[PDB]
Write a protein that binds this ligand. Structure first.
Ligand SMILES: *[C@@H]1O[C@H](CO[C@@H]2O[C@@H](C)[C@@H](O)[C@@H](O)[C@@H]2O)[C@@H](O[C@@H]2O[C@H](CO)[C@@H](O[C@@H]3O[C@H](CO[C@H]4O[C@H](CO)[C@@H](O)[C@H](O)[C@@H]4O)[C@@H](O)[C@H](O[C@H]4O[C@H](CO)[C@@H](O)[C@H](O)[C@@H]4O)[C@@H]3O)[C@H](O)[C@H]2NC(C)=O)[C@H](O)[C@H]1NC(C)=O
Ligand SMILES: *[C@@H]1O[C@H](CO)[C@@H](O[C@@H]2O[C@H](CO)[C@@H](O[C@@H]3O[C@H](CO[C@H]4O[C@H](CO)[C@@H](O)[C@H](O)[C@@H]4O)[C@@H](O)[C@H](O[C@H]4O[C@H](CO)[C@@H](O)[C@H](O)[C@@H]4O)[C@@H]3O)[C@H](O)[C@H]2NC(C)=O)[C@H](O)[C@H]1NC(C)=O
Ligand SMILES: *[C@@H]1O[C@H](CO)[C@@H](O[C@@H]2O[C@H](CO)[C@@H](O[C@@H]3O[C@H](CO[C@H]4O[C@H](CO)[C@@H](O)[C@H](O)[C@@H]4O)[C@@H](O)[C@H](O[C@H]4O[C@H](CO)[C@@H](O)[C@H](O)[C@@H]4O)[C@@H]3O)[C@H](O)[C@H]2NC(C)=O)[C@H](O)[C@H]1NC(C)=O
Ligand SMILES: *[C@@H]1O[C@H](CO)[C@@H](O[C@@H]2O[C@H](CO)[C@@H](O[C@@H]3O[C@H](CO)[C@@H](O)[C@H](O)[C@@H]3O)[C@H](O)[C@H]2NC(C)=O)[C@H](O)[C@H]1NC(C)=O
Ligand SMILES: *[C@@H]1O[C@H](CO)[C@@H](O[C@@H]2O[C@H](CO)[C@@H](O[C@@H]3O[C@H](CO)[C@@H](O)[C@H](O)[C@@H]3O)[C@H](O)[C@H]2NC(C)=O)[C@H](O)[C@H]1NC(C)=O
Ligand SMILES: *[C@@H]1O[C@H](CO)[C@@H](O[C@@H]2O[C@H](CO)[C@@H](O)[C@H](O)[C@H]2NC(C)=O)[C@H](O)[C@H]1NC(C)=O
Ligand SMILES: OC[C@H]1O[C@H](O)[C@H](O)[C@@H](O)[C@H]1O
Ligand SMILES: OC[C@H]1O[C@H](O)[C@H](O)[C@@H](O)[C@H]1O
Lengths: 390, 391
């Protein structure tokens, strides 16, 4: 969506994966979804310098709303968990320099069961627009046929621009067309800043593998329509939780960067490993994912439990991934023709490769004939960045 | 096998999972399976105090052997990767105060393709016995019918006892009885210090989950025949590698302890996290697994993505596991009736529970009535130890 927004993969935090739809603010007041929760989080992003690194969007997902519309017929946050109301929440969020995001649903209900938005789009839009929202996650649970769906996404999309408020619009449209018919991504892209493609994501290696395996096996349709204004969105970053091994975490991070994917954490920033936060904030990696160019990466090679990904950057510079899909054993070694890498370009004739992960080391120069070798840990990933001698 | 060995779950290291069958000592010398490597390892176990914690067995798995017998007919380690035959290495192993273990195969070939042992049992036995071996991993790849199999395991078993050398014999027999018939474990137990039951183990969470679930859904047959001399063996400990997250590592360790399982690491003790080594050596946890009693634990409860395991120990003390099988979200909380725990016993009248994992904390006293509540991380595990008293 060309609204001059998301001219770079959006960076922020989303409560979903880490807190799901928790409401028991009795025996569990800290995992409970409340303005108190976010308010805390907001503080932090600023504290441990998350904002400084790039994450600037704090967003609420499903289950933030009270059971039903008000006398006026607009939504309303749960009275008990959000007594002061979004608006005010937003103002704090803004006071702290951040931007707020809210969750909504095109159909008759959110995947949570709460209020939908069907035949309310316009109203709701103005609502948020007035509440002071900056970003909308438009989910699509509950709706007759794509007619109601497609139209709803499209419709709402227009409703917002109309409001005048600059709102990053994040669709989930595609994820729902499957498996009835491949979506017209060129279409969608004219309506979203970024959309979901695959199922949600567990705090697990499996869930991640499938997503890659999926985005791998589909680049034909998606990898292309990617670029400023509109991005392909895998899902939140579960790095900092528990389901992932170390080498599994670098992987997600490394690859989300390769796939110009929106960066949304879903972790408790209050209790997060230092080792984790380090990765999550690596200036050089965020830079790659935040490349101004907006050219989504893709899998180059397959075979021998090895995956080779790469994304062209700006200035003849290229980013490259090396995933060791071998669940057992130890660190294997992979070697490739420096030349037949950056589509032949990057490295002609000179190349400067600096391992940017998992240890940002300074490898030497590489000739077009030079052959590159490196070892990769099981389920891990070695991220490289190449510079051409120009 | 009542040979006065493994009167406690055997503790050691086995190169398999961490190094598999690596032979390229040209372009991959560090992973390469050679006497040089084992010598290093040996040294270390002693260094960072692994020996002190309990691990006392250093074992070689498949791919340690040269292509075929010698003139005499016995077995010979690969000439190049094992220039000093075995014996000598065993002296260095023995020197450090450790015990060595070697891999062999009942059939015509090891799962690697190397020399078998079919119609050589006796010879081989004496061989190892001579070489100064302390433990044998008898694998079972390649063989006609269980006839050849069952007999081979049984046969070899006797061959060793005969040699006179005290050799911990670790079978894989069962893993190979399926798909034919559930194993006369009472039989097997009269021939092994411990045997394999389920497929190999990847450096992955999945591989572990399946083993638990598989074992979970079989206790009827196995959990019972467990005790001194003979143990149920899951597989190596992949803690210290990369496939497991933190919460996932405590789990394996916590549960192997619950399942009086042999403790065999498969990691590079050179490049091993400090945080890892800490767990692997936790005195209180090793103690549980090393319980003198020899009563294998078992899953008590199911449901809601929660698993409750427990093993009775010695002195009216009980060990308890709490696995959060919920792959997504955050740390949930589980609460149970202190009473209906240690089969009703432990916690009558008082129960002193000290979280022994993942943070060994000192919880207070608990009465029979008492209700114990605790939160558990996703894919993680909270290990508890209850002792009986009367304050
Ligand atoms: C390891 O590999 C060994 C080699 O066997 C494989 O197959 C042969 C044909 C080659 O291709 C070889 O390269 C392969 O590796 C394997 O040894 C084999 O073991 C079986 C079981 O003992 C033998 O089969 C039997 O053969 C007899 C004939 O003579 C045997 O018995 C006499 C007296 O007991 C001995 O003096 C001989 O040395 C032989 O051992 C058959 O009588 C019998 O067959 C029955 O059914 C047939 C079918 O109609 C009837 O005709 C017979 O009368 C019987 O009723 C068995 O089939 C086989 O001879 C032997 N091979 C060799 C070369 O000796 C060994 O089993 C493998 N190890 C493991 C653990 O699997
Ligand atoms: C409702 O929908 C309409 C329809 O699109 C929107 O209209 C767009 O409004 C945005 C608002 O700025 C316009 O964006 C501007 O585009 C310029 C065109 O350059 C683009 O392409 C070049 C080359 O590819 C790039 O270098 C450049 O980055 C752009 O991608 C830009 O030059 C403008 O950038 C300027 O502003 C930014 C922000 O301060 C500065 O950082 C830059 O240095 C520069 O000064 C800007 O991005 C867009 O062109 C309009 N398109 C159309 C079709 O009208 C409305 O915005 C929307 N209404 C609401 C409320 O959302
Ligand atoms: C080949 O196979 C034989 C047959 O099993 C092995 O012999 C066994 O060796 C173990 C090793 O100790 C013996 O186990 C010990 O038994 C003691 C009791 O002995 C009585 O009961 C046994 C069992 O029926 C009878 O065989 C025997 O005649 C006795 O009546 C226990 O007291 C031991 O535990 C306690 O004592 C030991 C010994 O001092 C201490 O070390 C312990 O800490 C503990 O205090 C232990 O359980 C077993 O008894 C032997 N059985 C037989 C039939 O001989 C051979 O060792 C084996 N040979 C080779 C080369 O491997
Ligand atoms: C997916 O949706 C996009 C968005 O509409 C479709 O692309 C657009 O398709 C229309 C036709 O329906 C094109 O209109 C044509 O424009 C030319 C001049 O540009 C004119 O000469 C023709 O008479 C006609 O009006 C439109 O240009 C085109 N826009 C873009 C940016 O591609 C696309 O067709 C849809 N995909 C599929 C498979 O249907
Ligand atoms: C598994 O194998 C074991 C032995 O390897 C089998 O157990 C054996 O069972 C017989 C009974 O059928 C026992 O013999 C008994 O001997 C007494 C005298 O002491 C006699 O009075 C009885 O009539 C009987 O014959 C034998 O001791 C016992 N062996 C062992 C080691 O316990 C068992 O049958 C096999 N299990 C299955 C399911 O096949
Ligand atoms: C929400 O549910 C209502 C009621 O089930 C859907 O409305 C029906 O729409 C069909 C056309 O698809 C009409 O023939 C019916 O008369 C409608 N019934 C009512 C009570 O309005 C509505 O379409 C659903 N919304 C979505 C997005 O699927
Ligand atoms: O109901 C809440 C959930 O709804 C969908 O499943 C969505 O894909 C998830 O990310 C989350 O928003
Ligand atoms: O090749 C050696 C391997 O053979 C089998 O697969 C066995 O289960 C493994 O533990 C290992 O010993």
């Amino acid at each position: 969506l060309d609204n001059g927004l998301a001219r770079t993969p959006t960076m922020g935090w989303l409560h979903w994966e880490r807190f799901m739809c928790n409401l028991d603010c009795q025996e569990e007041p800290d995992s409970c979804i409340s303005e108190k929760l976010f308010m805390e989080m907001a503080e932090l992003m600023v504290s441990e310098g998350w904002k400084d690194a790039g994450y600037e969007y704090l967003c609420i997902d499903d289950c933030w709303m009270a059971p039903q519309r008000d006398s006026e017929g607009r939504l309303q946050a749960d009275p008990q968990r959000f007594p002061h109301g979004i608006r005010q929440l937003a103002n704090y969020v803004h006071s702290k320099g951040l931007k707020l995001g809210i969750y909504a649903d095109v159909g008759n209900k959110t995947c949570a069961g709460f209020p939908g938005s069907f035949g309310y789009y316009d109203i709701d839009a103005q609502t948020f627009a007035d509440w002071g929202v900056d970003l909308l996650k438009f989910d699509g649970c509950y709706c007759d046929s794509l007619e109601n769906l497609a139209d709803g996404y499209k419709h709402m999309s227009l409703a917002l621009n109309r409001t005048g408020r600059s709102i990053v619009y994040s669709c989930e449209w595609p994820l729902y067309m499957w498996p009835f018919q491949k979506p017209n991504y060129t279409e969608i892209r004219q309506y979203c800043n970024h959309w979901r493609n695959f199922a949600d994501i567990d705090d697990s290696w499996k869930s991640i593998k499938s997503i890659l395996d999926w985005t791998s096996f589909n680049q034909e349709r998606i990898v292309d329509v990617a670029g400023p204004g509109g991005w392909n969105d895998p899902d939140m970053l579960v790095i900092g939780n528990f389901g992932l091994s170390w080498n599994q975490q670098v992987t997600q991070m490394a690859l989300w960067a390769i796939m110009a994917a929106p960066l949304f954490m879903s972790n408790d920033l209050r209790h997060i490993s230092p080792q984790a936060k380090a990765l999550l904030q690596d200036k050089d990696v965020i830079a790659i994912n935040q490349d101004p160019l907006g050219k989504q990466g893709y899998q180059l090679r397959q075979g021998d439990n090895f995956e080779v990904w790469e994304r062209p950057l700006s200035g003849l510079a290229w980013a490259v991934a090396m995933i060791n899909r071998q669940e057992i054993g130890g660190p294997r070694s992979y070697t490739i023709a420096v030349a037949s890498l950056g589509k032949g370009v990057a490295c002609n004739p000179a190349c400067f490769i600096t391992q940017l992960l998992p240890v940002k080391r300074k490898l030497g120069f590489y000739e077009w004939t030079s052959r590159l070798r490196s070892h990769i840990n099981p389920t891990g990933t070695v991220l490289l960045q190449l510079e051409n001698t120009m």
